[PDB]
Each structure stands twice: as structure tokens, then as C-alpha cells.
Design an enzyme around this catalytic site. Structure first.
Site, PDB file in Angstrom:
ATOM      1  CG  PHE A  88       0.106  -1.798  10.682  1.00 44.58           C
ATOM      2  CD1 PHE A  88      -0.003  -1.120  11.899  1.00 44.58           C
ATOM      3  CD2 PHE A  88      -0.611  -2.981  10.507  1.00 44.58           C
ATOM      4  CE1 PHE A  88      -0.820  -1.598  12.907  1.00 44.58           C
ATOM      5  CE2 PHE A  88      -1.423  -3.462  11.520  1.00 44.58           C
ATOM      6  CZ  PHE A  88      -1.528  -2.771  12.713  1.00 44.58           C
ATOM      7  CE1 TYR A  96       3.066   2.365   1.414  1.00 44.84           C
ATOM      8  CE2 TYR A  96       4.202   3.870   2.913  1.00 44.84           C
ATOM      9  CZ  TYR A  96       3.307   3.655   1.884  1.00 44.84           C
ATOM     10  OH  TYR A  96       2.669   4.735   1.309  1.00 44.84           O
ATOM     11  CG  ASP A 113       1.605   6.154   9.297  1.00 42.87           C
ATOM     12  OD1 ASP A 113       0.925   5.312   9.920  1.00 42.87           O
ATOM     13  OD2 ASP A 113       1.097   7.028   8.585  1.00 42.87           O
ATOM     14  CB  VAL A 114       6.748   2.046   8.629  1.00 42.94           C
ATOM     15  CG1 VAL A 114       6.317   1.967   7.163  1.00 42.94           C
ATOM     16  CG2 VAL A 114       8.087   1.355   8.883  1.00 42.94           C
ATOM     17  CG  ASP A 115       5.484   6.699   5.223  1.00 46.23           C
ATOM     18  OD1 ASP A 115       4.983   7.271   4.243  1.00 46.23           O
ATOM     19  OD2 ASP A 115       4.886   6.602   6.315  1.00 46.23           O
ATOM     20  CG  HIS A 143      -2.063  17.157  10.090  1.00 49.79           C
ATOM     21  ND1 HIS A 143      -1.343  17.878   9.162  1.00 49.79           N
ATOM     22  CD2 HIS A 143      -2.579  16.094   9.430  1.00 49.79           C
ATOM     23  CE1 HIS A 143      -1.364  17.231   8.007  1.00 49.79           C
ATOM     24  NE2 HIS A 143      -2.125  16.158   8.133  1.00 49.79           N
ATOM     25  CD  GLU A 198      -5.344  12.803   9.406  1.00 46.25           C
ATOM     26  OE1 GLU A 198      -4.157  12.544   9.673  1.00 46.25           O
ATOM     27  OE2 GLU A 198      -5.682  13.503   8.432  1.00 46.25           O
ATOM     28  CG  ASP A 251       6.861  16.623   4.620  1.00 48.39           C
ATOM     29  OD1 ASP A 251       8.007  16.891   4.214  1.00 48.39           O
ATOM     30  OD2 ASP A 251       6.016  15.983   3.968  1.00 48.39           O
TER      31      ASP A 251
END
Length: 264
Positions: free
Chosen positions: A58, A63, A130-132, A152, A222, A245
Site C-alpha cells: 500500500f 508514501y 510495507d513500501v518504505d 520484529h 500488528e 533497521d
């Protein structure tokens, strides 16, 4: 069909691949880390079934800016050699970048302000991210299974009491302090189309119940994903190699590869 003859190192029963991490859950689901799989064997197995993988993202409002890097790096690293169908849900169809795709790979733009039958007809597995984000290393058929979640990256070393599950009993996502296997990341889950639809249907029903009761779970979908995966155990779990990350967490020795990462 039979696998062909293949030459590769013999697996050694009295030598574990990885001794520093848990590689199988207590319900006998593999936990996918580098060194646990021979990708040549897995590629043969999945190519012989002519496997098609759907990748859904999405990208709303600002975004859409993330799509170019997301898609270009997916072309380099995601299921290369296999059939891939990208599904990009967006409010700005014209802002989707024109990204050059490898053979056997296609992209559909879906405008948002209904996909159940389409996905069943078009792909064997669905992967929801997710796209980011960007791919930096191999993400392939080793993840594919009827239902998977991803550890996570902030909680893989944490005790269950520290997990940020929903703790209010008034929410459908409630998990008490003495329950929980792992804290799964909402940004990377998937499975067969049937199992992903079962999961999303259950999550949507739980979120509607919460809304009617005037409560919103602490971490939104989540929190509900975590409740679902507690009560319906995933058949594989992806290690944090698959959702990292580096700005926040560096590059620990336990991660041999950083495969899919946050864009800072």
C-alpha cells in the site's frame, strides 16, 4: 515431480548449521536464518511447481515516493527466477513509477479511495509488506509456506513480558503476560492465498469488534496479527534478517545478512 540429480555438501547430522540461534519453533516450524537452507534445493522444488508469488504493498499519499526504490530493489532480490505479481494499492495511480521488470514478472496498480477471487486465480502465495523499505539481499522461496510471520527486529531477544502486545482484556487482541511465543512484525507476513485470506478476515473481524466496543489496539493491525499467530501457529517464522533497521539497530553478529530494511 522428481528433483534432478544435484551435487551439494552432505548435511551433517552431528554438526548444526547454526548454534547461536533457535532454528525451529516448539511446534516444529523452521525459523529461517542464513545457513539453514540450501537455496538450490528449494528453488528446484518451487520452480517444479511453477510457483507464482504475489507481493502486495500500500502506497498512499506521500508514501508513493517509496515505490521506485522498493520495486527496483525487489527486482534485484525478491524471488528472482520465479513468477512474481506485484499488487500496488494506491490513491495516486499516476504517481506509480514506471519500473522495468524482469521476464515473468508483472505489476498491477489498484486504485483505492474485493481482491479475494483475483488473488486465488492469479498467485499461489501472498507476501504482504510495507513500501518504505528496500531489499538489500536475497528474499526467496525459503520464506514460502502456508502461513508465516517475521520476528520484529526490536524484540527478537526480549522476554515475553516486554513484548508490546495488547494488554487490555477489553480488546480482541489481548494477550496476557504469561502467553506469547514471539513478537511478530506487522510489516512482513504471508503464506498461501487461502491462509492469508483467513488471517486478514479474522483480523478485520477482530478490529470491527474492537471499534464497536470503543477500543483501538495499542499497535493496531500488528496487535491483531500477534493474537492470530499466537492461536494459529505459523508454519515458518522469518528471522530479523527479513525485517531490519540498520540505523536503529546496527549490524549484529547474529545477522549474517540484512535482506529487507527500513529506508531512513
Amino acid at each position: 515431480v522428481s528433483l534432478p540429480r544435484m551435487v551439494y555438501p552432505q548435511p551433517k547430522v552431528l554438526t548444526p548449521c547454526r548454534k547461536d540461534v533457535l532454528v525451529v519453533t516448539p511446534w516444529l516450524a523452521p525459523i529461517v536464518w542464513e545457513g539453514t537452507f540450501n537455496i538450490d534445493i528449494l528453488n528446484e522444488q518451487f520452480r517444479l511447481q511453477n510457483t507464482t508469488i504475489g507481493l502486495t504493498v500500500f502506497a498512499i499519499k506521500k508514501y508513493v515516493a517509496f515505490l521506485k526504490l522498493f520495486l527496483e530493489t525487489a527486482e534485484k532480490h525478491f524471488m528472482v527466477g520465479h513468477r512474481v505479481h506485484y499488487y500496488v494499492f494506491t490513491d495516486q495511480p499516476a504517481a506509480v513509477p514506471r519500473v522495468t521488470l524482469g521476464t515473468g514478472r508483472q505489476l498491477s496498480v489498484l486504485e483505492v479511495g474485493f481482491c479475494e477471487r483475483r488473488f486465488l486465480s492469479e498467485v499461489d502465495y501472498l507476501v504482504c509488506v510495507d513500501v518504505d523499505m528496500e531489499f538489500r539481499d536475497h528474499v526467496g522461496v525459503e520464506i514460502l509456506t502456508p502461513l508465516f510471520g517475521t520476528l520484529h527486529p526490536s524484540f527478537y531477544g526480549s522476554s515475553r513480558e516486554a513484548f508490546t502486545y495488547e494488554r487490555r482484556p477489553q480488546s480482541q487482541a489481548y494477550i496476557p503476560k504469561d502467553e506469547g511465543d514471539f513478537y511478530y512484525m506487522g510489516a512482513f507476513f504471508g503464506g498461501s492465498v487461502q491462509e492469508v485470506q483467513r488471517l486478514t478476515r479474522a483480523c478485520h473481524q477482530a478490529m470491527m469488534v474492537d471499534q464497536a466496543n470503543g477500543i483501538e489496539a495499542v499497535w493496531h493491525a500488528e496487535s491483531h496479527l500477534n493474537k492470530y499467530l499466537l492461536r494459529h501457529k505459523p508454519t515458518k517464522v522469518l528471522s530479523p534478517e527479513y525485517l531490519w533497521d540498520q540505523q536503529l539497530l546496527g549490524w549484529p553478529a547474529v545477522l549474517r545478512k540484512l535482506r529487507f530494511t527500513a529506508v531512513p
